[PDB]
């Protein structure tokens with residue numbers, strides 16, 4: 541379903557806009573007759589689907605990893621998520637905040653030292669996101685360089701080690717509070733999701749979000765003058781970018797009414813976060829002074845991003861510190877020359893971001 545990933549730079553491509561004109565829920569019978577698919581394109585309908593108990597995340601023919609919450613349905617999903625959820629409480633993010641600020645400052649220190657220009661994605665955003673993830677996980681300091689490199693069995697041995705001798709961070713918390721109830725492979729899988737796909741989403745928000753701010757220089761400056769706008773800005777940035785563009789299909793376990801339409805048992809629904817966040821032209825222009833941003837960039841319901849508290853805090857700290865420390869930041873090429881990754885279900889990202897100051 542490539543149309544769900546068609547963009548014009550950061551905006552929707554005309555072909556996807558035309559699809560969205562077909563209403564918030566679009567029936568897609570497959571030409572070969574093999575299945576009936578549905579596209580959920582509107583904010584309300586996406587929330588209807590994602591909050592419903594009448595869908596599962598089955599594999600459909602139209603890698604399974606231990607500890608990967610996104611591939612579990614209740615009740616195992618509920619069991620595992622309950623064990624790990626406390627690593628993201630407000631108490632946990634509050635304690636982590638100054639250490640994340642310091643890691644952000646470390647990386648802007650490196651940026652300030654190497655001097656301009658920099659390829660911001662590879663040299664700043666990536667390392668920053670990976671280092672914050674290590675700190676959140678409580679990876680032993682001696683292992684962080686190697687873990688980040690390998691990320692680009694080891695994970696299990698790392699989990700086995702840091703477990704039998706608990707430490708700090710999410711991994712230490714889970715092992716200490718639920719040691720017997722979680723295997724080394726499951727703990728490794730929890731780590732892998734944080735270090736791999738989560739860093740991908742976060743790094744892409746950091747780099748493409750920086751571009752977006754630079755493309756709206758009045759708002760770049762506004763965030764420097766009014767850093768209390770940071771939480772609002774992050775909501776508007778994750779909405780506008782929609783770096784996680786489309787979700788894994790939800791298969792109806794019984795006939796179910798969605799958006800006034802009957803989705804039949806066994807039919808698969810594809811939720812477009814991109815369309816839901818961007819296809820309403822009323823409130824689409826980028827504006828960090830919006831006090832409340834309407835979006836589903838982190839999903840909704842039982843699979844709502846477990847990392848959203850960390851992501852929101854890390855992005856707020858990063859964007860606010862960046863605009864403060866580099867008031868003269870600009871793209872080192874015209875924005876129209878920036879390359880974006882071609883249509884894919886992979887994370888939406890730019891390919892490089894040359895910046896100067």
Ligand code: HEM
Nearest residue numbers: 609610738741742745784787837838839843845846847851
């Ligand atoms: C801007 C960054 C991020 C975005 C846009 C994002 C987006 C999402 C979305 C849309 C989902 C739900 C997928 C679905 O329902 O099919 C999700 C799930 C998840 N996210 Fe994130 N994510 C981000 C960062 C993070 C981070 C930093 C972490 C961990 C530290 C994380 C961990 C997870 C996990 C573990 C799940 C699965 C939860 C479950 O299935 O119960 N994510 N994410």
